[PDB]
Ligand binder design. Sequence first.
Ligand SMILES: *[C@H]1CC(=O)C/C(C)=C\C=C\C(=O)O[C@H]([C@H](O)NC(=O)/C=C\C=C\C)C/C(C)=C/[C@@H]2CSC[C@H](C1)O2
Ligand SMILES: Nc1nc2c(ncn2[C@@H]2O[C@H](COP(=O)(O)OP(=O)(O)OP(=O)(O)O)[C@@H](O)[C@H]2O)c(=O)[nH]1
Ligand SMILES: Nc1ncnc2c1ncn2[C@@H]1O[C@H](COP(=O)(O)OP(=O)(O)CP(=O)(O)O)[C@@H](O)[C@H]1O
Ligand SMILES: Nc1nc2c(ncn2[C@@H]2O[C@H](COP(=O)(O)OP(=O)(O)O)[C@@H](O)[C@H]2O)c(=O)[nH]1
Ligand SMILES: [Ca+2]
Ligand SMILES: [Ca+2]
Ligand SMILES: [Cl-]
Ligand SMILES: [Mg+2]
Ligand SMILES: [Mg+2]
Ligand SMILES: [Mg+2]
Lengths: 311, 419, 58, 434
Amino acid sequence: MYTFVVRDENSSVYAEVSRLLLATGQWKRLRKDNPRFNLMLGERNRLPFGRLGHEPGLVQLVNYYRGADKLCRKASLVKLIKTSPELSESCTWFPESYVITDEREVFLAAYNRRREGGNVWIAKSGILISSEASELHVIQKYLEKPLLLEPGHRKFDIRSWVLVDHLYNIYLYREGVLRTSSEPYNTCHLTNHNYGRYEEGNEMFFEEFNQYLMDALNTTLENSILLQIKHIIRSCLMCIEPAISTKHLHYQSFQLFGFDFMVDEELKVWLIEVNGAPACAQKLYAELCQGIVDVAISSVFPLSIFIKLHH
Amino acid sequence: REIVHIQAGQCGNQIGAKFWEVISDEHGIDPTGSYHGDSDLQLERINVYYNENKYVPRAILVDLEPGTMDSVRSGPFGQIFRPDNFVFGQSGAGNNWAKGHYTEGAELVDSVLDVVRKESESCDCLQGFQLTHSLGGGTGSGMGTLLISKIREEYPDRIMNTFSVMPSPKVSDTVVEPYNATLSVHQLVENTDETYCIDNEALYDICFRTLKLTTPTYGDLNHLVSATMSGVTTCLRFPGQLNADLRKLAVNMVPFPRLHFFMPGFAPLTSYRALTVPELTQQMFDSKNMMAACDPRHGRYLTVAAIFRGRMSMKEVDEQMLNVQNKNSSYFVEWIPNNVKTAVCDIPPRGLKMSATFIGNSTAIQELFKRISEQFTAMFRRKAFLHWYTGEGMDEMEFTEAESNMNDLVSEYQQYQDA
Amino acid sequence: VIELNKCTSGQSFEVILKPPPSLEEIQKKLEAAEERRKYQEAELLKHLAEKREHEREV
Amino acid sequence: MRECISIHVGQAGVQIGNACWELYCLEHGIQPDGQMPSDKTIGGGDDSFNTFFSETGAGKHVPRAVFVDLEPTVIDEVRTGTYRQLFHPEQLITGKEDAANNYARGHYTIGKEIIDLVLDRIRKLADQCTGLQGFLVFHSFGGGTGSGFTSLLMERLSVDYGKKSKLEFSIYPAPQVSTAVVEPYNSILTTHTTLEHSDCAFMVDNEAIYDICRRNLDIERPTYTNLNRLISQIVSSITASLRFDGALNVDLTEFQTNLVPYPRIHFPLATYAPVISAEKEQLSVAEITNACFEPANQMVKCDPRHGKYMACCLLYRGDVVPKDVNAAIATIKTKRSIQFVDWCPTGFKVGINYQPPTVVPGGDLAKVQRAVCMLSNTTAIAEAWARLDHKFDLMYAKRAFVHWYVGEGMEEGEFSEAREDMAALEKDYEEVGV
Ligand SMILES: *[C@H]1CC(=O)C/C(C)=C\C=C\C(=O)O[C@H]([C@H](O)NC(=O)/C=C\C=C\C)C/C(C)=C/[C@@H]2CSC[C@H](C1)O2
Ligand SMILES: Nc1nc2c(ncn2[C@@H]2O[C@H](COP(=O)(O)OP(=O)(O)OP(=O)(O)O)[C@@H](O)[C@H]2O)c(=O)[nH]1
Ligand SMILES: Nc1ncnc2c1ncn2[C@@H]1O[C@H](COP(=O)(O)OP(=O)(O)CP(=O)(O)O)[C@@H](O)[C@H]1O
Ligand SMILES: Nc1nc2c(ncn2[C@@H]2O[C@H](COP(=O)(O)OP(=O)(O)O)[C@@H](O)[C@H]2O)c(=O)[nH]1
Ligand SMILES: [Ca+2]
Ligand SMILES: [Ca+2]
Ligand SMILES: [Cl-]
Ligand SMILES: [Mg+2]
Ligand SMILES: [Mg+2]
Ligand SMILES: [Mg+2]
């Protein structure tokens, strides 16, 4: 019998992992504060990483990488990209961004240069999209030329789910989702969940998107977009590996990340953000959650939907 | 350093005699008190139990009639005891706590204290006392608890430990045992630091069901007991780190002062084959190897001490002890971190290559007090058999008070079981 | 590298990668604790004395 | 030359002390009878090794040490063991009955009755010093003597030697070898009462040492003997600067200056490499230095990547030259997560002693050509305080075992006061480390 504890009651992903574990017949759920667990499904804030890996005779695993917040907060991602040489200030796949020490004067200088020669930016940390510096946390270049789905002239973003195991294998779940606007593009600007007119729940899955890319643009999802998604995922996660790896540590970590991308009308992919505690689309819970159990948990506690991004 | 041992009444002297035979054999001491062993481990801590080229038990033998102590003196190791340490009257206690505690026992107790004092006074640094008795009769129960109270008054900063045999209707001499045990438990709650609760019904059922003895005698039961007493005193009597003295044991085992009643256990108990550390460990934690007739799965462990004896892998011991805790973690209160401690002594008991002894402070011990409480009430509601007690000067109010105090103890265990 | 000293036993140096109660109070605490121990023992002995009176009554 | 007096309190303090003095003898060429044939000044002198050893007219080299324990069996081993002729009886103090794993019994009940005798024996050592620097105090956190007696002693030393430094070598509790359920209480009580009296404390977690012994020395079930031999090597690395010629950490006050810019945050993390089995290919300067950033080699398991550094000292023994040290640091900075606080410089103080580590003949540790002990003051060691404080909280919330302490005359409020100090400590580390 393996033991685990549940510390984030609100995680739809870990509620399902927990159900799955219990249904194996080989895992038992302990009360939240019993220290004699194999597996912690941890709380989202101040997870007490300092109390892990000090239980004689128990291999202990947690579903968060300590330090991974550096990728998963807007302003810390901006700083990570600008201050890491492997990512760098000139990184071609992350929009020009400023943290608002503050980079306000650097922002202004870039804004003015451009105004002298498209100058829409987006403030976020409550979102504002504007042409005027004055009206305008992070300030980021707003992608003025998005790829628009037809029919309906509509914006979208891509969510990719990524699982990083205890060995720092990086696995890209083979199903992603497009979250679409169902308003024609200049609510038409922000693709956060005519609602449901083109697709159920304003989500388009990869089979349909690929079919659309073949029919309308004479290319594939693989070639036009996933090569770049994979590159970006690997680049981000390889960058923080020395700071967060649990390879020689007294406890081990895995974590599920939700990476969000925009595609421009030249089929260039841009990273928008990394989510450290994602939800999953309704119809993909069962498959993803079982993948989590197979690759992240049962790999460590013996009883493919994933592309392994090699490095 | 030194412990002073007291054995009172029939049960107390019978099990006490067996304890001394068994530990004398382990320490290489023959019936004439001469040492004839072959390991220095035997002698390193001998003075804990023996005065000194002869070794004499630090043991005082008490009764209100001479017969059991006559048998002790004739029995196997009977000549090893100091003759001045036999203190006994003639009239008996008639299975009556009041006779032991208030009338007959009162006439003899000062002479017992004289001997206690003489043994205490030649101790370099007395740690405290261990008493063997039953709670169901008169002398061990009534006079034994009188002694405990008098010792506490004269040595209030020393530890008091008892091996207390608890009565059962299934292995019973008289109907008044629940009265005598309830009156005694009230004393133990206030005046001992550590009481090993040994249930006669558990001993019987172990002998009958596990050991396949068709008709157990008191002799059979006492064999069990003396094995367990040997196991539980191992860390007092041999070199080691953990629970090496009475006060250290109490600090590790007793989180609240009243909750000092322990369920002991022994492994192996089977009807030549090698025993594995896995088997010892699993048997030690099984209800059928425990001596209080309470199911530990009906409560939680506040604290546990485990002692392994024999040549065996220390690594595999640590491993199996962690397996049991990690696998059954719900039966261990979570608000006492690391509440199971393990000791290992190289010397096995006679006849065994390997053994283990368990001492649990479990809230399930409530079941033993509840049983005694129910048997007390069934009689006391009709004031049955009370004339034996009132004729010695006691009032009904003292029975009401003992009953309440024991019910209070039951509630206290329940509280921590739920916490 | 700054502050290099050398001797026949070894050397040492510094490398910079970047700049930027009284006796009386103790004695009283120990006595106050001893007094609490004594109080607690006196209470015990009082309780034992009451038990002895009861024994004599019976 | 300025003397240092070592004080060994309780079982752990005494057994570690024994291991340390034996190793010191072997490092300095001092025989079990106290004779030191290489020392050409007979009956006196002011060499570096004289910081730890006085000399008699007969040429005996005597540890500047006191051993104190509340029961006799551990010190009796010193009295009768290999190095027995090194010590005189007045250096060896024993009572009859111990503190039963109870800080209050050690501090209040038994401590009151032996503290004066201990001070008189320390004073006899002090009176032989021309320029006493202060004290090195070795004890457990978990034991009743190591916890409770040490904190009384530390308070009384601040009164009688108010200008002297006091360093600690403290054994943090680990359930794999611990002997009491109440060790978290003892730890927190003693840390609260000692905090203002100690200038620098080196905590060693028995869990970390046990694991190093299991993994690197291939010992399946380490004994205190195994553990204490490793600990003595680390201790010797740390005190080597006091006992040999050198320009780094040559007096007790420099420990504070170099490692402790904020007085309450005075617990440097020691990391040691290499640890190689005697029964079992020689590591370079680069490899041993890189190993100092590995949690597995630390005396307390914690993650420095997720705190900040206030100071970092590298202490090398054996065949090491500055050039190779600097090249190693260069490499490691480009690979590892080493963030200093903003108000201290980013850099390392380095000491090299050319004599490689001595090992005890037929011990478990192989002889190596070079070894290093890194002392870093990182906020990550606060993980250990979090761990302890949480254990304390679980038991204290039900008042489990409190009656044993109250019954020795401690007030219950001393628990909550000690705990509140620890909470302020955790917050001090968080504020520095954010
Ligand atoms: C008392 C023994 C005595 O009077 C008679 C004999 C010959 C044996 C009694 C043995 C006994 O009770 O053994 C139990 C247990 O049944 N033994 C085993 O399970 C053995 C092997 C298991 C393998 C799978 C153990 C016991 C209580 C022994 C004690 C030790 S202390 C001294 C007494 C002697 O025996
Ligand atoms: N490393 C190491 N730890 C030890 C040693 N002896 C004891 N310990 C640890 O120290 C703690 C127990 O404290 P002890 O030092 O034995 O107690 P004490 O100071 O003698 O106090 P009392 O016996 O209670 O008077 C536990 O955490 C033990 O694991 C030793 O030689 N080395
Ligand atoms: N630089 C940019 N250019 C164009 N659109 C942008 C953009 N930054 C954000 N958006 C749009 O705004 C939406 C919300 O932005 P952001 O990625 O900050 O979301 P969010 O953090 O609220 C929820 P999620 O965690 O699911 O992404 C994005 O999906 C995208 O539609
Ligand atoms: N295990 C065991 N129980 C005994 C023995 N002799 C008596 N008893 C039990 O002890 C109780 C009676 O007390 P007893 O010791 O005979 O009376 P006392 O002589 O007045 O102390 C009852 O519960 C009996 O079952 C014995 O040798 N062993
Ligand atoms: Ca009479
Ligand atoms: Ca000299
Ligand atoms: Cl001074
Ligand atoms: Mg988001
Ligand atoms: Mg009888
Ligand atoms: Mg001790």
